[PDB]
Design a protein around this ligand. Structure first.
Ligand SMILES: Nc1nc2c(ncn2[C@@H]2O[C@H](CO)[C@@H](OP(=O)(O)O)[C@H]2O)c(=O)[nH]1
Ligand SMILES: [Ca+2]
Length: 104
């Protein structure tokens, strides 16, 4: 079974941790990758009810299993905070415009 389901993509908690670990490391080094400069500040315009405190940062999680290294970010994101705590996994899939919905 999927721990997180983003549209058609299936993710296990181990997939999330690997992606999150990579994103946070770049965050610590103040470096970014990709045209959208990830990891990027996530403002939570959606108003998701995360149990961890902000600031939040979004980092692409890929259905392929590989860690994001530039190129197309796809539609899924892992959101983590400054304390490297997972806030949630969200996606553009099934969301209006450039908005996000949480993965189930
Ligand atoms: N929907 C949404 N986009 C955000 C938020 N914070 C930052 N963004 C960024 O603004 C951009 C335009 O909505 C998004 O780019 P993306 O569409 O390439 O992922 C996303 O990275 C937020 O809280 N909600
Ligand atoms: Ca996997």
């Amino acid at each position: 079974a999927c721990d997180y389901t983003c549209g058609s993509n299936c993710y296990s908690s181990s997939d999330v941790s690997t992606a999150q670990a990579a994103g946070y490391k770049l965050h610590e080094d103040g470096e970014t990758v990709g045209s959208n400069s990830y990891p990027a500040k996530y403002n939570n315009y959606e108003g998701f009810d995360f149990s961890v405190s902000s600031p939040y940062y979004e980092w692409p999680i890929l259905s392929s299993g590989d860690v994001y290294s530039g190129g197309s970010p796809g539609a899924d994101r892992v959101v983590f905070n400054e304390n490297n705590q997972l806030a949630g996994v969200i996606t553009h899939t099934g969301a209006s415009g450039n908005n996000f919905v949480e993965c189930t």
